[PDB]
Write a protein that binds this ligand. Structure first.
Ligand SMILES: C[C@@]1(c2cccc(NC(=O)c3ccc(Br)cn3)c2)CCSC(N)=N1
Length: 377
């Protein structure tokens, strides 16, 4: 039943979308970040200032210690944990319980964030990027092996008490309108895809399309921003600046380190361009585009202290590890992770972004003469 799964996600702007899960016997309830950009199931398992609660292994009679540790450094933050297995369920997901690997986080630095309301991360990507290595079976692989659940899930993330839906085992048509367009998964590690063209307010960036995928492009619900390779980022910022030049932006705004604010309701959306990302289609040299509005890439901040005005952070940033289509891109689209057919689908979601003049869209097909492979691999 997909209806029971609708609206099973919550979150805070720029804080992460999480689903309720249980671990252990009897079940211990925790909120878990849904992350298509990693492959470990990892949960706080010791007290922490920012943790509202944690996994208590000694209180679970079904816990099995794997007698192995794991250290996972990120660019920002890090945690250390002990690997084990236990019974895991998703109360508002599939009606099943499975035994899964769990990394019990016993030490961390700048990993858990105050007020996020999640206590762990559910890595939904593939084993190749699991830590400490690809022999640690990811949760979704365990789910499919141990149950009759079809090998796919879909995410409908809705921007700013319900934050969206994770539907496991199929597609819920009530969550999107129009056509569902599919792009192939290039390699099963991250959810890697190929961008073939980029336009900003209708204007082609006219780069070799391999530049858009240097050194990979991925779909990642565990990253807030649209992250772009240096060359593409500079070109995008140049275009957006030119379009919005009628207004001055604080030092550091384009680096994402500063807010811009307007009086309530007066945000000049119309001076900001739409961004179109064309994704490789399922047929040779065909593609489709998803169009991103400023309502997506100018992310609202919901801090009470700033609430007299409407303030935003620039949610596009520079990457040295490839393009990342993060949450601000996924928001408003229904995104189908069709692992069974090695493809990802996009459709306009019931909570898609729009104003009176413009709307997020998924459109195709588009045809390209140049037969170059846009893969950087
Ligand atoms: C595991 C890792 C990770 C670790 C620690 C926090 C996070 N994400 C967030 O805090 C986060 C915040 C707002 C949104 Br919207 C989505 N995610 C992600 C590593 C960095 S990139 C990634 N996808 N996953």
């Amino acid at each position: 039943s997909f209806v029971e799964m609708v609206d099973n996600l919550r979150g805070k702007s720029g804080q992460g979308y999480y689903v309720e899960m249980t671990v252990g016997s009897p079940p211990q309830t925790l909120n878990i970040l849904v992350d298509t950009g990693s492959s470990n199931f990892a949960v706080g398992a010791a007290p922490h200032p920012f943790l509202h609660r944690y996994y208590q292994r000694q209180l679970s009679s079904t816990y099995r210690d794997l007698r192995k540790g794991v250290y996972v450094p990120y660019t920002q933050g890090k945690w250390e944990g002990e690997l084990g297995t236990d019974l895991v369920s998703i109360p508002h997901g599939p009606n099943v319980t499975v035994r899964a690997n769990i990394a019990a986080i016993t030490e961390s630095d700048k990993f858990f964030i105050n007020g996020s309301n999640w206590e762990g991360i559910l890595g939904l990507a593939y084993a190749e990027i699991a830590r400490p290595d690809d022999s640690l079976e990811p949760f979704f692989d365990s789910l499919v092996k141990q149950t009759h659940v079809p090998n796919l899930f879909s995410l409908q993330l809705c921007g700013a008490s319900v934050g969206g839906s994770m539907i496991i085992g199929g597609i819920d048509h009530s969550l999107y309108t129009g056509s569902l367009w599919y792009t192939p998964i290039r390699r099963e590690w991250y959810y890697e895809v190929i961008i073939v063209r980029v336009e900003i307010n209708g204007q082609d960036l006219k780069m070799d399309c391999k530049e858009y995928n240097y050194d990979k492009s991925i779909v990642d619900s565990g990253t807030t921003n649209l992250r772009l390779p240096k060359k593409v980022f500079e070109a995008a910022v140049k275009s957006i600046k030119a379009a919005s030049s009628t207004e001055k932006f604080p030092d550091g705004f384009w680096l994402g380190e500063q807010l811009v604010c307007w009086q309530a309701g007066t945000t000049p959306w119309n001076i900001f361009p739409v961004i179109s990302l064309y994704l490789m289609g399922e047929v040779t040299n065909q593609s489709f585009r998803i169009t991103i509005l400023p309502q997506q890439y100018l992310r609202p901040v919901e801090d009470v202290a700033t609430s007299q005005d409407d303030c935003y952070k620039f949610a596009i940033s520079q990457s040295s590890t490839g393009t990342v289509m993060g949450a601000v891109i996924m928001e408003g689209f229904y995104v189908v992770f069709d692992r069974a057919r090695k493809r990802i689908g996009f459709a306009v979601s019931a909570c898609h972004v729009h104003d009176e003049f413009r709307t997020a869209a998924v459109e195709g097909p588009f045809v390209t003469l140049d037969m170059e492979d846009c893969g950087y691999n």
